Design a protein around this ligand. Structure first.
Ligand SMILES: [Ca+2]
Length: 223
């Protein structure tokens, strides 16, 4: 996250870190057994880390649970990033508490102008590289589909939305991928892609979670 703020420990209780020896992507806890992330974060050997603030220090609220199964969206296309969503099942159920909590799925899509919270352990610099140990947060609005499409000609599908600031300086970034965009208490986006980070006229692009609620629910119901 570039241009954000330190969230505070366990203030984003649905945020997970995906670990394969190291943090590599975010995700969102949606029930005691399942995490939502980006399909481009897929890899074998995932350990889901819940209850994290400093990802390099054991602080006392963590739950580390290996993934039993990952399900990339049936129609994910890694070239275009269309349908950049996956589900990860935990080998054991998380113990839910005030610091480890699921986030609700949306019932309808969000609208441009809606304020959201974006979070992660990704790069905090737009030129250069600095990875934080503690969780970072950014409040940002959803942008109109027309402004999104104009910013990224030929690239924005109906399964994507833009959020952030056209002036630059405030965005998600590499290492935030897979993490949450939460608006009014609902998971509306997944950190997906963008041109660099925090660049003028290049807002963040996010997977449009509302399009996937039926798939998520049916997948969980049979897995
Ligand atoms: Ca920790």
């Amino acid at each position: 996250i570039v241009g954000g703020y330190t969230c505070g420990a366990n203030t984003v209780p649905y945020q997970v870190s995906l670990n394969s020896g190291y943090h590599f992507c975010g995700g969102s806890l949606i029930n005691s057994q399942w995490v939502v992330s980006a399909a481009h974060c897929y890899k074998s050997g995932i350990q889901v880390r819940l209850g994290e603030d400093n990802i390099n220090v054991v602080e006392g609220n963590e739950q580390f649970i290996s993934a039993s199964k990952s399900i990339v969206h049936p129609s994910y296309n890694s070239n275009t990033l269309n349908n950049d969503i996956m589900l990860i099942k935990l080998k054991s159920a998380a113990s839910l508490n005030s610091r480890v909590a699921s986030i609700s799925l949306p019932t309808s899509c969000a609208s441009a102008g809606t304020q959201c919270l974006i979070s992660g352990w990704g790069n905090t610099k737009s030129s250069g590289t600095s990875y934080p140990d503690v969780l970072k947060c950014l409040k940002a609005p959803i942008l109109s589909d027309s402004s999104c499409k104009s910013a990224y000609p030929g690239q924005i599908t109906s399964n994507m939305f833009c959020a952030g600031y056209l002036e630059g300086g405030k965005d998600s970034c590499q290492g935030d991928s897979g993490g949450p965009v939460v608006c009014s208490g609902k998971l509306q986006g997944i950190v997906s892609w963008g041109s660099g980070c925090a660049q003028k006229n290049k807002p963040g692009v996010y997977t449009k979670v509302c399009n996937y609620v039926s798939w998520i629910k049916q997948t969980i119901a049979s897995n």
